[PDB]
Design a protein around this ligand. Structure first.
Ligand SMILES: [Zn+2]
Ligand SMILES: [Zn+2]
Lengths: 49, 269, 214, 269, 213, 49, 49, 49
DNA sequence: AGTGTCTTCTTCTTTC
DNA sequence: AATGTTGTCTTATGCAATACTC
DNA sequence: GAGTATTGCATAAGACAACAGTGCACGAAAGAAGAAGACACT
DNA sequence: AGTGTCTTCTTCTTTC
DNA sequence: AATGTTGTCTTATGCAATACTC
DNA sequence: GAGTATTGCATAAGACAACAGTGCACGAAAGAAGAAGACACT
């Protein structure tokens, strides 16, 4: 999965996440090695590298 | 002079115009050469997401709770909207509990008919099995939004602001700049109800009540092109509703209906 | 229009829990009913019911006024004059007052007793299901037919219909002349889709190049 | 008709077009009748302004303090800017006390020339007694800003963000995710100062190390129309400088140069 | 300028423990920069050089001395990273390097005089030394040394004041570009210009005017 | 100082007003003899004389 | 003088007082009862009615 | 999806790359054999067929 | 009468 | 006593460079 | 042989965002975990 | 004895 | 499971409709 | 009498805030006011 970076409520960009499936404004995000697969709004994902 | 510029950015991270002026290299070459450190390469995309909605007059509802300080001890207000022809229904309880929104919806149904789906917050009172069995027995589908985003219910998080403004004006238009006496709120909320949806709101040329009762729906639409993620605008689609944004597109080949921002739409021919 | 005259009535049977002394109001044209609880027979607790009925139905013109109890106070008279509605205040029972509400009262009593018996509590109902029980009776009596007709009060009072064609539009842009009048469609940015009245052909005329005829 | 509308509004305040509808009233009459309820309407307010600057260098220095979390032993950074030719100088300290400020205003004067105004905020360190005598000994004027306001020192406030971003991207160049070792906490600010001084910034033409030593001063300006309180634009003024959002106009016959927003200026002929 | 930079180390006890001081002077419009470092270290030498560069500019062909903590391969790599000619000349060595010692005594007498002026016969307290050292910088680099009419900072930076813009190519109503005009205030849209000799003013659209050669 | 030129119902061009406090959306009506607190929209008004 | 709805630190608009002297983008405001003059940036005042 | 061509450091148009759901600005692309996904800016990539 | 599940009575968790 | 601001990204537009064509 | 005809450039507008002494705090409804006491099979 | 300023301490206040 | 929005203001044009101007 | 200025209205075309369960809390430097032990007077 393409590595992307996410946005927690304390305005800080976390790395170490990969996407699994997208939709029409929501995405499925999984941690690098501590998988807690969750959903996330579209406007919180930034591509890396 | 390029070899120097390769290490100059690594050493300093100055900028493309400065590199071009200090090494006599073209701007295109400088821009090309300055991509090695993601630190200097922000590369923001941030995506975009918008507009979930329904179409039929009596198929999608939304509901939520608010707190009003000026209001009497029973200071909790439940408000609901129907996101096809915007209509507002509000009641007052004062104690957020499971038995509150099982009489709230009972009152709400008796003026609008039975809806077919509800999408609300994932809070406490909406999750109890006592309410789940009640919903199942009545026979209405139910779903919930994402745990944390407040923008999923914008269609009511915008309406409550207008409701608060109207109620504040009506309150302090008659010499009541404090807690309203307990013998007037019942009569005041009815007048607020009447004033909200019986006349044009803003600039649309139709009363919400008549829009709800006698709506307009059309079959087939004019040709239109949509800029899907494949760069350019495809064909084989028709627009059947389009307002201040949030366009809706129906398939032309076999069948589908989707909701897309009003940016990927051009009136072909 | 089915908005010509309303009727109001005050009803006993405090077998229904405290907040007894119910108030009921029915339209004659479409036979729609609204009922509310009360604390006591007071002039101030009349405008509450009237405002609720207005907000739920519309603005009436003539209201059959019950005579004698509290519908004579100057406060209520000026409240009525503020909105400007015509009260009758005739002789109750024979031709006014209890002229049409008999069947409505009987039906509501039957409904409330049947719903009470269907879920238990032979004696006085617990004072925690008042509104949630009243709403079911409201919905049943106003949505699931009253007699043996296909003329349920909601349909006969609101006349529900479905529309497919919009308002007429004029295209007086060619040389200052328009056709007989065409049909407007989706009003997207920049242009305005228009279909012919007869040949039914879609044209993307510019938005600046269309006007509302008559 | 022009009847029943007044009491309709004063009882159920609504929109102008809605009031005009169902009463066959013109838009102008609707507006003049709605503009009577002081509870509604009366929206517009607010104005703007600019910060005075200096035509020549060494006139309007500004200074302030900050705090860098990754500067572990002594964060407490101090920064100064010129506001004529945009050059900056920084200093490190471990405790905000009114001896540190006096120490800081000893390297800035050594590096640059001698200023004439050091306008800053009204923090406890600056408005002391030991500082006033020290300042008067050298002979520099002093003034402060409005208490609580933060937009007065906009130049240094903006420069702080650039400084922090540069220091962070330079810190994470060789690999240092935590507090920098004290051994290398030395010759690291020098590189940042060199980069921010002896090179181009953004897209400008000249470095602010020559823009300071050899500035450009004009003697006359082309005719220019300037907005006044009234809609009329007065002509007969001469511009001196014109940046992104400011102007430095001057009178033809009284020499009363004043700074105004860049919106109220147009060329002549 | 920035040709023969000279830097050197000197001990001084009338100070903080701080048993060393590093001085640097340019052999053209001589300007002095001195640090206040303690025990001799190559890291401190790098720090001093970085501070001097940041305060003056990027020099070339620097000579300091030979021996001591100057032959470190780490220092060699650090110098080569920027890229500077390095000379291993003998410290002092008379010749054209002696201005370091010439200015050392001047600095010593100046600092002792200014220290003894405000009390403190024997030794200055610790939290009184930064500003004391800073004042010497200004007193030595913003005034004529003892005989010249131009300060070292003036002779090093060549100050001047300008009042006219660069030449700018102007398009006229023939397709070609006219020559011999100067730019002025860059207004909104317009790019007002002046003649070189006839002293005219004229507003011109931006697309009708381009930078000159 | 300098008075204004305003509409209310028919035309009141007369003097006795000020522009000492001027706004883009209003003009702060204030009479030199009695003062006012209402303010007036600036678009529908104009300079006196 | 014409009063304003001067803003407070957290945020609101209340009928506080009027303005005594003006100039560039800053103004001096009075007080109704305690009568303490306060300087304030122009971008915080708001005309009444 | 369909084959695509991108601009590698020794600029040319080559094959063996599949584009998934696209995205304005920066995109992702995968390999056929190595199945290796990368982020590439917009103007550097062109559809093959 | 040990335990053993049933009863009950606490102590944490989530979401707003 | 005492007033916002710039470095980075994005999208809009006129003119040469190889068909072009009848 | 002149339209034309697109396409690849070289450039102007035109927004965008964060910068400010530092961050947490409590109340409430419903449910889940676990654990101690109590009467029946053992 | 009543005071009483001098000095020192003890709080309270205001900005960031 | 599970995706921003809309009533209020200003500023930007055209052309019919008076008002004129040699 | 054709070219011209003014308006006015009529659009229309963008921008523009505010809505989310409730709001605070703490550290530090410098100064200022008031009060208590104390050795004049007394
Ligand atoms: Zn970089
Ligand atoms: Zn009003």
């Amino acid at each position: 999965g393409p590595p992307v970076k996410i946005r927690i409520e304390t305005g800080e960009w976390e790395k170490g996440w990969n996407v699994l499936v997208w939709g029409r404004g929501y995405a499925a995000v999984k941690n690098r090695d501590t998988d807690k697969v969750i959903w996330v709004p579209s406007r919180k994902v930034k591509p890396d590298i | 002079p390029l070899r120097e510029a390769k290490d100059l950015h690594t050493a300093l991270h100055i900028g493309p115009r400065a590199l071009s002026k200090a090494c006599n290299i073209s701007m295109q070459q400088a821009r090309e050469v300055v991509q090695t450190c993601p630190h200097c390469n922000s590369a923001p995309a941030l995506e975009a997401g918008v507009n979930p909605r329904g179409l039929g007059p009596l198929q999608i509802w939304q509901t939520d709770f608010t707190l009003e300080p000026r209001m009497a001890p029973r200071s909790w207000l439940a408000v609901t909207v129907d996101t096809a022809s915007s209509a507002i229904v509000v009641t007052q309880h004062g104690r957020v509990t499971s038995v509150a929104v099982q009489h709230h919806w009972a009152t709400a149904i008796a003026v609008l008919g039975r809806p077919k789906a509800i999408k609300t917050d994932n809070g406490s009172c909406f999750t109890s099995k006592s309410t789940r069995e009640w919903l199942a027995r009545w026979g209405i589908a139910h779903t919930t939004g994402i745990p944390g985003n407040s923008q999923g219910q914008a269609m009511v998080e915008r309406a409550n602001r207008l409701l608060k403004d109207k109620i504040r004006v009506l309150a302090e238009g008659d010499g009541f700049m404090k807690r309203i006496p307990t013998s007037k709120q019942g009569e005041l909320l009815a007048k607020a109800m009447y004033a909200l949806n019986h006349f044009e709101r803003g600039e649309n040329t139709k009363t919400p009540i008549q829009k709800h009762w006698r709506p307009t729906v059309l079959t087939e639409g004019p040709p239109v092109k949509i800029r899907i993620e494949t760069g350019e605008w495809e064909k084989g689609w028709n627009v059947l509703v389009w307002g201040r944004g949030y366009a809706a597109v129906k398939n032309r080949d076999t069948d589908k209906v989707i909701w897309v921002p009003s940016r990927k739409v051009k009136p072909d021919i | 229009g089915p908005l010509q005259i309303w009727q109001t009535d005050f009803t006993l049977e405090p077998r229904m829990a405290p907040r007894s002394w119910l108030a009921v109001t029915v339209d004659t044209a479409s036979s729609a009913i609204v009922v509310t609880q009360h604390g006591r027979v007071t002039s101030v607790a009349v405008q509450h019911h009237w405002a609720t009925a207005i907000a739920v139905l519309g603005r009436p013109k003539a209201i059959k006024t019950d005579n004698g109890s509290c519908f004579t106070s100057k406060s209520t008279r000026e409240w009525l004059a503020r909105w400007g509605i015509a009260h009758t205040t005739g002789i109750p029972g024979n031709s006014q007052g209890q002229a049409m509400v008999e069947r409505a009262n009987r039906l509501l009593k039957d409904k409330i007793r049947v719903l009470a018996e269907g879920d238990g509590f032979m004696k006085r109902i617990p004072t925690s299901k008042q509104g949630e029980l009243l709403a079911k009776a409201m919905y049943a009596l106003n949505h699931f037919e009253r007699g043996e007709n296909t003329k349920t009060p909601i349909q006969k009072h609101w006349r529900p219909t479905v529309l497919t064609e919009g308002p007429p539009v004029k295209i007086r842009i060619e040389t200052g002349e328009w056709e007989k009048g065409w049909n407007v469609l989706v009003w997207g940015r920049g242009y305005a889709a228009v279909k012919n009245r007869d040949t039914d052909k879609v044209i993307w005329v510019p938005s600046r190049k269309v006007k509302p005829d008559i």
